[PDB]
Structures are given as C-alpha cells and as structure tokens.
Amino acid sequence: GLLKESMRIKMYMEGTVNGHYFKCEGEGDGNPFAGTQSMRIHVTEGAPLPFAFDILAPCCSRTFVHHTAEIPDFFKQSFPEGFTWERTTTYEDGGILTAHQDTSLEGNCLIYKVKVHGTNFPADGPVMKNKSGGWEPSTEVVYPENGVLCGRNVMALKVGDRHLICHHYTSYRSKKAVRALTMPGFHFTDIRLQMLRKKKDEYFELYEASVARYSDLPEK
Amino acid sequence: GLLKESMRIKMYMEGTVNGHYFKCEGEGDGNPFAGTQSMRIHVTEGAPLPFAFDILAPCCSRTFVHHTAEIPDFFKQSFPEGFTWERTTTYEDGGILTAHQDTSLEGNCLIYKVKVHGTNFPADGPVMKNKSGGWEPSTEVVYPENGVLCGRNVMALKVGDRHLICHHYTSYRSKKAVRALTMPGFHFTDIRLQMLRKKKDEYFELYEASVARYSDLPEK
Amino acid sequence: GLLKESMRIKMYMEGTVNGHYFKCEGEGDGNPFAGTQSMRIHVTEGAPLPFAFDILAPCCSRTFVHHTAEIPDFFKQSFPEGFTWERTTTYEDGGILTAHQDTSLEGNCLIYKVKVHGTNFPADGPVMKNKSGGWEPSTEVVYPENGVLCGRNVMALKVGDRHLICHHYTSYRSKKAVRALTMPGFHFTDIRLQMLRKKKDEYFELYEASVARYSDLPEK
Amino acid sequence: GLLKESMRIKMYMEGTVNGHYFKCEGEGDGNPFAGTQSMRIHVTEGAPLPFAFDILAPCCSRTFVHHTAEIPDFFKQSFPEGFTWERTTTYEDGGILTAHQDTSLEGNCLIYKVKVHGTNFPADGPVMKNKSGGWEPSTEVVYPENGVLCGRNVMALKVGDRHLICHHYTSYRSKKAVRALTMPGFHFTDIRLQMLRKKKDEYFELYEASVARYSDLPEK
Numbered sequence: 001g002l003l004k005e006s007m008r009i010k011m012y013m014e015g016t017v018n019g020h021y022f023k024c025e026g027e028g029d030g031n032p033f034a035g036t037q038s039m040r041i042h043v044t045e046g047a048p049l050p051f052a053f054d055i056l057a058p059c060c061s062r063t064f065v066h067h068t069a070e071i072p073d074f075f076k077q078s079f080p081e082g083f084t085w086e087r088t089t090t091y092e093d094g095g096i097l098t099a100h101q102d103t104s105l106e107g108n109c110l111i112y113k114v115k116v117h118g119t120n121f122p123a124d125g126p127v128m129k130n131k132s133g134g135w136e137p138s139t140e141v142v143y144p145e146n147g148v149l150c151g152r153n154v155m156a157l158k159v160g161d162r163h164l165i166c167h168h169y170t171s172y173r174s175k176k177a178v179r180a181l182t183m184p185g186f187h188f189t190d191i192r193l194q195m196l197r198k199k200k201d202e203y204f205e206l207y208e209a210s211v212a213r214y215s216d217l218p219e220k
Numbered sequence: 221g222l223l224k225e226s227m228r229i230k231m232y233m234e235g236t237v238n239g240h241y242f243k244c245e246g247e248g249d250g251n252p253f254a255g256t257q258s259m260r261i262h263v264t265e266g267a268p269l270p271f272a273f274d275i276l277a278p279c280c281s282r283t284f285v286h287h288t289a290e291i292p293d294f295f296k297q298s299f300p301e302g303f304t305w306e307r308t309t310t311y312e313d314g315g316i317l318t319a320h321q322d323t324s325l326e327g328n329c330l331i332y333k334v335k336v337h338g339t340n341f342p343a344d345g346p347v348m349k350n351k352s353g354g355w356e357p358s359t360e361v362v363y364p365e366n367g368v369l370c371g372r373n374v375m376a377l378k379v380g381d382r383h384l385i386c387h388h389y390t391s392y393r394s395k396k397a398v399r400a401l402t403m404p405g406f407h408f409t410d411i412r413l414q415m416l417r418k419k420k421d422e423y424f425e426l427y428e429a430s431v432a433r434y435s436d437l438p439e440k
Numbered sequence: 441g442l443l444k445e446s447m448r449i450k451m452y453m454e455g456t457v458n459g460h461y462f463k464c465e466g467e468g469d470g471n472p473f474a475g476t477q478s479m480r481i482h483v484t485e486g487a488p489l490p491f492a493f494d495i496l497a498p499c500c501s502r503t504f505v506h507h508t509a510e511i512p513d514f515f516k517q518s519f520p521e522g523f524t525w526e527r528t529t530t531y532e533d534g535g536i537l538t539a540h541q542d543t544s545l546e547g548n549c550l551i552y553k554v555k556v557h558g559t560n561f562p563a564d565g566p567v568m569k570n571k572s573g574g575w576e577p578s579t580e581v582v583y584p585e586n587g588v589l590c591g592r593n594v595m596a597l598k599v600g601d602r603h604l605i606c607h608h609y610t611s612y613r614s615k616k617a618v619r620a621l622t623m624p625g626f627h628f629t630d631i632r633l634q635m636l637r638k639k640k641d642e643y644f645e646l647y648e649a650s651v652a653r654y655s656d657l658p659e660k
Numbered sequence: 661g662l663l664k665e666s667m668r669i670k671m672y673m674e675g676t677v678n679g680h681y682f683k684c685e686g687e688g689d690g691n692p693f694a695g696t697q698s699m700r701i702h703v704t705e706g707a708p709l710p711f712a713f714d715i716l717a718p719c720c721s722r723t724f725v726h727h728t729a730e731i732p733d734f735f736k737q738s739f740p741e742g743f744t745w746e747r748t749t750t751y752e753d754g755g756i757l758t759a760h761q762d763t764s765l766e767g768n769c770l771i772y773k774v775k776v777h778g779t780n781f782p783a784d785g786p787v788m789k790n791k792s793g794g795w796e797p798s799t800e801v802v803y804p805e806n807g808v809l810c811g812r813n814v815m816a817l818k819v820g821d822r823h824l825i826c827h828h829y830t831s832y833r834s835k836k837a838v839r840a841l842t843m844p845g846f847h848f849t850d851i852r853l854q855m856l857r858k859k860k861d862e863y864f865e866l867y868e869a870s871v872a873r874y875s876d877l878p879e880k
Contacts, residue, residue: 094534136406137435139359141374143383146783152374152385154361156406163363163406165372171779173679186356186376186383192437209437215357217412217429236540239524239613308559314609314752316528318538318557337557339538340528340609343585576846577875579799581814583823592814592825594801596846603803603846605812626796626816626823632877647880655797657852657869
C-alpha cells in the first residue's frame, strides 16, 4: 500500500507571531486509517517562544482521519502527489494567524512544510501572555467548491475557566488532477487536539484524533 | 411539571430585509425533552416575500433540545420566567441578519416574539434572488460566560449543489436569576432544520430536531 | 420649487450600541443645492452616551449634495416621495454598525427616521472609551445597480495622531418609481463631516458639506 | 538627482491565480514628478492567461505620483534604498489577491519584483471567465502609522454595464531609515489605471496617472 497502517511524519515550521521570528521541527507518527497521530515539536530558533504554542498546534495533518459512512477521502486520494492547505484563523480578541502548508510523501514518511504569519494578538491577551490551556474538541464543516475542499470551524481556546473563540477558514488543494479525484459531499470532521507535554516554551508533545462523518440526527 | 411532553408554540415575527418589511405569525408544537418541533408560519404583511425565507427559519426555539450526558438545560431551567436571545448572522457574500427574540410561557404554550433586521444582501445573490434550497445540518458550539450562554455556529445554505456559508454569533440570556440557575459547561448542539413545505412565499412549514452533547471522540 | 434654497431638517434616531440603548432628536437646516447643512442633536434618552457620538454622526443626509458636471441627482429626484438608505459599517478593530433610515418630506421640512444597531465594539477601543477626535474627509464611490444607488467608502476616525479605519456599504433606495428616475453613472461624492460642538455626551453640533463629481484625472 | 524627468521601469512578476501558475515580465517608462507612466507586459509562462489581467494590473508603481500642496513624498524620499509594499485585495464575489512587491533603483531604471497569490475567484465570475472591461478611476486613502504608510481603496472593475467592487489594503514600507524620512499627513491619491491594448492574453499595455492631494472640500 502507498499508505500503510503506520506512517512517519517530519514537519518543518517557520514564521513570525507579532514580530517574533521562530522555527520548529516536528517528528511524529500515526495511523492514517484509524485517524490517530502524535508529534514531538522542538523549537529550533526563537526559543523560548514569547507566546502560546496553542495557536501553532493546529498547523502541525488531515491525512490522519478515520472516514466513516464511505465518505470519499480527499487527502488519502491525493497521494502519491500530496496536497496543500491554506488557512486564516481570526481570534475574537483581534489576533490573526495565516498559514500555508505543503504535504508531500517520501516512502513511508509524510513531509510537512509550514509557514505561519501572526499579527494583532493583544499584548495583554492570553496568547502573548502565554496563559492558555489548550483547545476544546471541535467539529469542522467540510464541503467541495471548484475542486477545492473547503473547511469552516469554530475552535475554543481554554483560558482558565473561560474561552477565547477563533474561527478557521481553510482551503485544501490537491496536487493530483481534480478529474482524478472523487470529491466528497458536505460532511463534518470531529477533531480533538491535545497537548500531552510542554517544556520551557521550547519542546511540545501533541496528539490528535479525527473522524469524518455525516450528522447523527435523522432526516425527515 | 411546567414543561410537558407535548407543548404548543406561538410566534410573532417582524422586521425588514434589504428594506422590504414583513410580519408573520407562526403556530407550532413539539416535544421539548425529545427536542423535536414543527411550525406553520404565515406571512401576514410584505407577502409575497421577495427574499428566501431560509434566512428567517433559524429565527423561528432552544427549549426543544434533547439533552444527553446530564448536560444542564439553560433554556428549560429558565422557565417560568423564560429567556431572550440575540444573534448576529454574517453571510460570506456580505449579507448580515440581526435578530432579537423574547421567549415567554403562557399556559402550555411557548411564546416567541422576534425582531429582525437583514441588510447588505447582494441583489443578485441566492437570498434576494430567492434561489436557496434549505440548510445543511449544523453543530453549534455553546459555552458559559458570566451568566450568559454563548453560541457559535457555522451554517451552510444550499444553493443548487453549492453552499453559501454564514456564521452565527449568539447570546442566550435567562430572565431567571443567576443564583437560581445551573450553568452548563462547554458542549455542542447538533441541529437539523428542515423546510418541509412552502407556498407563494407566504406560507412555510418547518421541522427541527436538536441534541445537546459532548464530543464523541475518545480522550487520551 | 419643491426643494428650496433653505430647508429645515428634523431627525429622530433610536438605537443600541454594545447593548446601551439610546434615543436622539435632531433639528437642522441646509442648502440642498450648495450641498451644505448643519444639525443640532440632543440625546433624549441614554445620556450621557458611554461611547463616541462620532460613530453615529454619519447616520444623521444625502439630499444636501452639490452636483457637478450634470451628474443626475438620485436623491433630489426622489422627492416628494422621498428615499431610504441603509448602511453596514465595519470597523477594523471589530465594531459593526448597521443603520436604516427613512427620508420623508413635510412641506419645507425633511424628516429623518433612523434606527441604529452597534455590536462588537471593543471595550478598550477609542469608540467605547470615547477617545475619538472626529472624522477625516472622505470620498464615497457611488454607482447604480438596477435602480438602486450603491455607495462604498473608506472613513478614517481620528484617534490622537492615529486613524481608525472603517468601511461603508450603503444602498440608497428611492420611494419613487424606478422608471421615473434618471440614474447616474459611476461617480464620486466628497464628504466632510465636522463636529463643531459637543457637550456632556448629550448635545452635539454637526456641519457637513458634500460634492458629487467625477475623477479630476484626465482620461487617455 | 536620483530620479529624473524620464525613468525606465522593469518588472518581474510571478504567482498563481486559482492555482494557475504564470510568469510575466514588464518594461516601462514614465515621469515620476508628473505622476504618469506606461508599461508593456509579456506573459513568459502560463500563457494564454485563463483570467482577466485586470486583476494583475494594479500590481504592476507609486514612484509615479504628482504631489500637490507640498505633501511629503514617501516614495521618492525612499531612494536610493527604495521601498516595498504588500497588498490584499478582496473582491465582493469572493476573489482575493495578495501581492508582495519590492522597488529598487539601478541607474535610471526602477526594478519591480512582484509575487502574486490569487484564490477563491468564482469559476463563472468575470475574472475567471475573462469578461472584464478594466477599472474605474479611484481615490486611495493614505495615512502614516509608525513610519509605515497605509493605503485603503475601493476599486470597481467594469463588467459589462455593471461594476464588481473590490477593496485594497496596503502597507508601504521604506527601506530608508525612519529618521531620514519626513512622513506625510493624512491625504488621498487619485489613480486612473488604463489598459490601452491587449493581445492573446499574453501581451498588455498599461497607462496610469496618479495625483496625491488633500480633500477639495472647504473646512468650516
């Protein structure tokens, strides 16, 4: 199989958040079909980070999604060629993060190349003050548009007992020919992003489980 | 006792969309604990509506939500006093609908009073051209904030085989005292709103089912 | 002689900004053909206002525009029937203000009826903190769309030596028969709104001049 | 001295629009002080372009602006070092084009280096159908912010007898030291871009005139 029960992951991330340059490398693994993965991220430049790594966590993998109900798989179908994505995340307190990502394959290794740009995050807000406590689980809305898979999502950043809301606008683009793909219909993807460990705003351990599904409610 | 397995609904709505004024009155019924409901809505002014009623359907019932996993019911706990809600809906083609709603109870009948102001909808878009085909189901994110329950949601209006996305920013306020209320934590509400019939842009039949729940994904 | 060289104006404004309810009444005068006017406004309810009146000033008169180069005058043509407008303004630090207006005539008095709704203005921002110093002059883009006149404009709110930008999206609708109007083509409207006097966030004095024109640049 | 009555221009642009890679090269001339210029553009790769070159036309020159009323010239002051700009253009039908440009000076020749990224242009819209008729003239709002010059603009693409609005967001950054620059005050730049000729979607002739000025309206 071109994709196997176990895949390795190599990630390269670079960017600026409110002017602070940084660079990290991730190494990970996962099960494409069970939709589970982990990743160890080491900040190679700009450490310790003067902001919450939480904002960068969702930049670190849509190949690893368990597809139910025979929902065609835009991401797995795109291999060996791979795919890209481009996201805008707007935080309700002013912050904005934009990211462009290339996903490539090399034998058993998936290669992620990310570039990030963050601005307008408040100086006294939870991200720059580094007082965030991870994400709530989420459900992405996913639908096709002109051969591109579109994503919309509300994510809730834990700030103590409260929540800071951010909004995702994503476009997944295949490197494979649009005609060679079977686009899915409108559906959802549940994502649970967890940070298992963090050390000195420099080393982070992530874990994520994802399932693609239709609504569980009956139709009339 | 207050709330029963079979309840009545009466709705009074008025407002403007892109300058066109309309009033309508609805009568409905449902099972608030099974979180299902129907409503027949009659347009008594501004008929025939020159815009798609779809943009008004979500303005027409948060008492009718089946709560799973012991999730406290903000809405049901608010009776007899009832509650209000305030929503801003932004459409990605520039349209914006603001709604203000009051929910009270008279006998075995819930009373909804609704004010609506839609504006900036494109003259040639699916709303003002009246070419939409109902809503996809959705999953609202819902979380407390100092006595007020907050709602966030991505909705997809069907336009042919394509989709027009809009975003809900809701604030649910109880007319009951805070101390007399058990606020819920972070959770999701699945919603499936369907329009089962419409006639002469003056009569509509809605049906909706809602379930409050947590993420179905396992947690590591 | 339906519109004369000197006209009276009565304005009635009601609204809520960030949930603060208010009512205003205005009386003014102007020269419609010279495109000059002034208004004395009094906050009859919700005084003192807990935000900058500057955001409301553009809601308080497109009859008063000096038209050059034989540009057809959509607004003056609409009398005696009159016209309506509505506008969505978006502030770049999060604020959104929707407004809808009716303009009617009563002999020598123009009657303005305004409904305003502001939300998402940041508590720390210069609007809610009341730290703004009036608007810079602006040039609106005016174009016809199917018997409706559309307006786009970038306005700059002075905040010390800085500027906070907001974006206007306006639709002017004649209450006169569409076929009875001579629509203009694409053109510009220069507008200079000044706040001459303010007192205790309760009384305000405005002066505005406006000119309709084409670009002064030569065409090649 | 550094700039002359007549200057040469050379441009190197590349990027993608809805995923179509293109490369093109320009050569031009103009009078920096008179504020006029022209350019010939050749699509060296990705010809014939499957979209309206109209979207790329505003990416091809702020050195060529006639400054009135003794307004400081951010762009002419920036030489020999030169300057950069970065723009986002949003079309009201969903299209978005982001560009980053570098302006340098070698002898009597200004060198432009442009990277374009265009996405979400409707498949049946006038851009991708290549059915536009150039731009209307415009007036950019320009204002200083911490040594950076900020530009805001509403532009209108002619499509048949109607207009498709788009919105420019630009930051111009000088490569010259802040202290070696007298920043201008708040002002406008009138701009009229014209396409005098096009051939086989691989050759285009442009002409542009710009004037920097204050509002023509009196100040009461």
